[PDB]
Symmetry: C4
Subunit: 310 residues, 4 copies
């Protein structure tokens, strides 16, 4: 079976109450659609009012300088667009015209107010900054001061902060319960700092996120040899608020069994030049292999505790 | 007595400082109300200014092409709606007219700015996306790798994420204190992942939320037999931010004693077809019963610890 | 010395970089101020451009139907307010006029866009909903299933939720360190659910917040008799997001030594009528006294542990 | 090597997918840029439409009172700015003109709606309130009721709250792993209240943040004498939401080895005058030295435990 989350963040799952917010069905779409639909609803109000204008216009013979429905449209414009050329002006004789304008004048400033709002949000869409946050292309497993770690690397490309940025990881893997319940893409959390507040990053330059593999880690029992065989996939989530706007964004990625590398280790990406720190974004995804025991974290521990014991 | 929260999210409780924010009294209402009140306040400003316009107009005899108060309204329009037909134009002779326009011109662009804002928020109301988040219709109680669990199922229907989505549960049940204090619909939290960060979901496909029933669970003492008799109600809360807009939404639901099912178990809703995961939303609320001890979680434990002991 | 926070939420403390956000100096003010300043800056742009218009107008003799600076103002209006009467129209002969309009036309739609924004936020100010959240007028201390508690009561008046609502408390009291450092209004946290997630409320009807007084509570050593003498003040903070808008609000209050009541107990405010829960907001602040040991929580404990011991 | 974060908050690090949000590349810039670019895109639409207007205008000979491209611009204005002088009015004879206006009329109210939005956010930028939050200029190390502390001081200058304000600290220092991995500006968290909820401030007057130096602190092994030699830098982060708007802001600062002062102690900044608390912001950064053991926190402890032991 094939992966839940694509390396780039989109998921591999497809799914009446979408009119309960006819708002959000709009915001997901793409530009040329909106631009036309904007016009669609803009165009139609001019038909709608232009028909109703001609409805009370035909009854009359409130109207100056018109000939057909070609003029009911261009009058409907001088109104809603509040252009008002003053060639086709309003006149007093009839008691019907004013209160239609009043219907329109308000409604035309409603159609605008509705649709400055949606434009704004479309522009301001947070998910866009999900582009300028990046993950390393592989995760690695290797030793760090005695304990075995699973490490992936995280980055922010834009010169400005993404405030309140945290991270979490989820292990996805089907399992069976002693009882017999199969649970298809079951999700359990991976400790990446939660308990100390170390998962609350400070993302000014690329950081290495490190999950230590201990009795509670999923990778406790997994040795180098077993790893390739294992059918797990690690989902990785960076969440934070765009300094620029309070908008709260999220960046996902994924590691599948074959993208975790046993015994390797990230290239450093930092150096100092004339007062600024230099990120060599070339070295970002790069890793190298070092000497790394091949045993599971568990077997590795016992070999330690037998040493201290003797 | 009858339930606190309706399966759909509204609560069964009814309640001077509502003018301390005359803002929020507006936003709760329904469309046809606003649409009229918008017009109400729109219409009245044209009366108000039109009266005041005629006030200084009568004194004059700043005014061109008017006859009655029929013209003070249509002039009041060419101003506020900034239409300005140029049939009824301003003129210099009087020192009074300009500074009224200046009162209006600003105020007309105030009445707009006020009421693009409220339109926007009404459109953008987060609570709307509370529709596209769903809970299972029943909760169940059954075994999962040895420990007894209370499980309900949670979903997101819309193809897009609801960011930073967490969950919590509250047990509502009246109680008495040794002391004698009766406490009517008293609320205590149910562990659904809080301590590990497992309550911080990743809601891409329906998940099963599971509260393990241990010494600290409310359901420690409750056996299958006792359950029907118990007068509890579990309130369930999903909170998160709409990816689309930073708006922070909340979805509630409820389980009452008779909607928890002992010994059952959710149907899986997942399958893989040609590269996409298939949610069979038909199987969403569906459960089946499996073999499940009928004892309380407590009695079930002791029977275990007596086994290990011997 | 006198209290830090007034029962109503304002604090009793008074305080170059206020132009680093000339934004927020604006939003704190009151309506009549804005309304005038709006006009102030609106009025002045018409002077400013009207002077500059007459500057290039005098040079000319781009201009139709003007006499003095009375017309440079009313032309400056038909421009910025985009009214454009078409009595005073633009003309081609001069190469200077168009690019000033272009300066203005853009700037007039800037002055608007600037000041729809601030209007909006002023309207939408979250702190307003700090009015519809209420605290009980007193806190009490009395027993709850064996342990001694400090309890105050919290409410939401508006029929709609305030999402993600939590609570915290701070103990304020000057102290001295063995070392000798005096620390004037020093602040330490009071446990009101933090460790279990019980401080994350569900505020649909008034709840009683309860801090159990244990070895870690500030009130461990304080007996009934000592209480009046103690110079402490408890600050109470309710934080949450307005369901209506993502705006994140905060409601404070305070308890000083003499407003905590030993041995009392809140009146219940709940009852059920024909399917709706009835909050008797009359009974909201009301308490009564019950039988309550007068000893400190500490002395009360030891008397227990000596009992179990024997 | 030189510091990661400047005392004022900017970092000392410099860094295709910046068009994936051409939104945020805009908001970082400075006023005079926007003001011109606004005009840039405003000016060009009048060229663009004015050319296209003349395109179908030349074909004609929909047009009244024009001479060259000087009029195609001033007509393009009476349209987009919705000024509509009514000297140059629309006419019926041609079937081409109306649907271009309809292209424009909508697009002109799009260019506006786009660029009220960005104006707004630029105005409302949260990072601005990062100016009115301040840190003390030095941190100090000295005793507080027996335990050794690292303390820095934090403030809010503006009379209004910054809601939900928390604090965290990061220790930055390169290190080597037994294994051999060098890790250049490696980041580990410093406890400043996280575990008790004491890092969740109530910032009404300047507070002293205190990290107790215990077995888990980085400063466990560091004595007064060693301190100057150590190459560490403490990064300090205040995060919270502007009461005024939900915008979520962040304020950083930094302490390098030589800005931590062993044996000193902050001057109190509080006093009471006629009912208001007086902050003497003069005493804000000020410290004095007191009698302070010079040993590391570790050696200091053992000397204690040897005392209790005997
Ligand atoms: K914690
Ligand atoms: K927000
Ligand atoms: K107009
Ligand atoms: K106009
Ligand atoms: K006009
Ligand atoms: K925790
Ligand atoms: K916790
Ligand atoms: K006109
Ligand atoms: K905690």
């Amino acid at each position: 079976i094939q992966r839940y989350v694509r390396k780039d963040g989109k998921c591999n799952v497809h799914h009446y109450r979408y009119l309960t917010d006819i708002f959000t069905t709009l915001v997901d779409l793409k530009w040329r659609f909106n631009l036309l639909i904007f016009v669609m609803v803009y165009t139609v109000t001019w038909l709608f009012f232009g028909m109703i204008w001609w409805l009370i216009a035909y009854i009359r013979g409130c109207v100056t300088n018109l000939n057909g429905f070609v003029s009911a449209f261009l009058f409907s414009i001088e109104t809603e667009t509040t252009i008002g050329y003053g060639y086709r002006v309003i006149t007093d004789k009839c008691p019907e015209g004013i209160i239609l304008l009043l219907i329109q004048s308000v409604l035309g400033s409603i159609v605008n107010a509705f649709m400055v709002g949606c434009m704004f949000v479309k522009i301001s869409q947070p998910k866009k900054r999900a582009e300028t946050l990046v993950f390393s292309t592989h995760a690695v497993i290797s030793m760090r001061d005695g304990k075995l770690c699973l490490m992936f690397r995280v980055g922010n490309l834009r010169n400005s902060h993404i405030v309140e940025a945290s991270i979490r990881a989820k292990l996805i893997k089907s399992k069976q319960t002693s009882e017999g319940e199969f649970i298809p893409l079951n999700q359990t959390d991976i400790n990446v700092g939660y308990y100390t507040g170390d998962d609350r990053l400070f993302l000014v330059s690329p950081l290495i996120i490190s999950h230590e593999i201990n009795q509670q880690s999923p990778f406790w029992e997994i040795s180098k040899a077993q790893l390739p065989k294992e059918e797990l996939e690690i989902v990785v989530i960076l969440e934070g608020m765009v300094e620029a706007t309070g908008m709260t964004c999220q960046a996902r990625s994924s590691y599948i069994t074959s993208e975790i590398l046993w015994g390797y280790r990230f290239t450093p990406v930092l150096t100092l030049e004339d007062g600024f720190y230099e990120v060599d974004y070339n070295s970002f995804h790069e890793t190298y292999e070092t000497s790394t025991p091949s045993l599971s974290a568990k077997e590795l521990a016992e070999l330690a505790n037998r040493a201290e014991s003797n």
